[PDB]
Symmetry: C2
Subunit: 237 residues, 2 copies
């Protein structure tokens, strides 16, 4: 069964986000993909009669050996705690297996030899992470990384991203909505007071719709043509 | 005073409530040696930011002079008083973040006596036992039995890592789940009477909450184990 993958690592990325490194158990194989794309993960949650399938963006660069995805605990401390995300967080240990369906998706980086801007918030960072590592392996110049999250504790991939930015000589800017920090802006992401490649860059977007629709209308306005704005949605939320 | 600044290199989920932290000195250079079974101290200042808090955490890997791993149970989940330091570490201390760490100490640790070795623990009691397993693996020790009790599959700390060691070293293990059955585990309380064990010659090392400790020590004595061959450390609650 080529779908059977085992969890080799389970890393906490932030307060609500945990990563899973997955490898074939039963003779499957790690297929190539473009950064931005997703795989389907199938598990059978506790109590539940049924198998359940959810999509998760690859969060690292394609290497043919292992996949990484990064899962937000959805609906935490709420009326309806997300079914698959909680099961993954609470029950799927290193050494446990899941069934996995091959990479696919309409959203992915395309090399156009132009500047690149990655913008995300919250768990929308996941496909941006795959793109960052890919660009890093390609020694792409002209990369800007713009990221928003509620606070330091929800700052997903903070260290990993910072090392990459410094190593490749890129630039980044982070906003914490709910508190202040050094080199961090406080509040919602504000894109007027900083240097962006508006005329020629490609702008890649991923986050809650509210966060995005805001910034999608914002770039249309700033002169960027819609053909240069690319975005992913984790469903209609 | 505080001891010394370390940085979280890795944050791995071990089970539903236990998360490991791999810590390296912010200095660089060697960290103090220790005996498997000993603990370090962690000190932080929780989001209720008045005072610092210090807690003992057991080393859960073999000593190697370069980094420390500890494994921390989220205490008091679902209670009126979720444990301050454990929740702070789980929720706020990310990879790349730093903590203050005190040097290894403690009177409970493995001593080579060329006897068969029994390791017995429950829940997070497994943490120092993990340092001991790794040390004995390194030393090619033969005649090791690992006995472990936890509530269920989702709380089965180090399940994969321990299975691998055992499969690599030719050792023996038995696992008990208090609240459910599973393939090749016993359901219920750890009962020793019917196990093949080196009662006359073995060293018995025990770690876990006091109630479990009292329960196991009474069984050991009734079976005929000399008190001088029972070594133990209590932490709970
Ligand atoms: C292309 C794609 C990529 C994705 N990538 C990622 C990723 O990288 N990381 C990641 O963590 N998640 C990602 N998701 C979201 C993921 O697929 C799941 O929908 C999510 O994990 C929730 O599933 P669940 O079973 O936990 O919650 P469910 O039990 O299915 O539903 C949770 C509850 O909240 C509402 N809800 C349902 N889905 C969502 C949602 N996605 N967001 C907010 N509220 C919701 C529902 O009405 C439901 O009542 C992606 C989704 C898509 C389509
Ligand atoms: C030698 C040794 C080794 C140890 N090794 C480990 C290890 O490897 N891993 C590990 O996870 N832990 C270990 N511990 C235990 C650990 O040091 C902590 O005691 C534990 O993490 C709890 O700390 P906390 O700050 O999270 O909880 P605390 O906040 O100290 O709470 C302690 C208990 O008191 C209750 N409580 C707190 N406040 C109140 C209040 N206002 N009213 C009523 N009740 C309250 C809490 O619910 C909790 O049950 C070890 C302890 C010792 C002595
Ligand atoms: Cl989010
Ligand atoms: Cl919110
Ligand atoms: Cl820090
Ligand atoms: Cl001695
Ligand atoms: Cl138990």
């Amino acid at each position: 069964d080529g779908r059977t993958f085992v969890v080799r690592e389970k890393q906490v990325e932030s307060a609500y986000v945990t990563s899973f490194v997955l490898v074939p158990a039963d003779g499957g194989a790690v297929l190539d993909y473009q950064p931005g794309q997703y795989i389907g993960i199938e598990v059978t949650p506790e109590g539940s009669d049924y198998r359940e399938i959810r999509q998760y963006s690859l969060s690292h660069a394609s290497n043919g050996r292992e996949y990484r995805i990064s899962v937000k605990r959805e609906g935490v401390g709420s009326d309806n705690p997300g079914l698959v995300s909680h099961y993954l967080h609470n029950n799927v240990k290193v050494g446990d297996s899941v069934k996995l369906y091959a990479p696919a998706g309409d959203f992915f980086y395309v090399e156009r030899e132009r500047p690149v801007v990655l913008i995300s918030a919250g768990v929308g960072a996941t496909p941006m992470q795959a793109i960052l590592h890919t660009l890093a392996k390609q020694n792409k110049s002209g990369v800007t990384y713009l990221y928003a999250c509620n606070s330091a504790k929800e700052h997903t991939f903070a260290q990993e991203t910072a090392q990459l930015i410094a190593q490749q000589g890129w630039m980044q800017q982070v906003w914490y909505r709910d508190e202040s920090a050094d080199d961090v802006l406080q509040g919602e992401m504000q894109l007027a007071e900083l240097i962006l490649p508006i005329e020629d860059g490609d702008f890649y977007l991923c986050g809650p719709i509210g966060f995005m629709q805001y910034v999608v209308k914002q770039l249309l306005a700033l002169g960027v043509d819609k053909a240069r704005i690319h975005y992913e949605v984790f469903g209609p939320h």
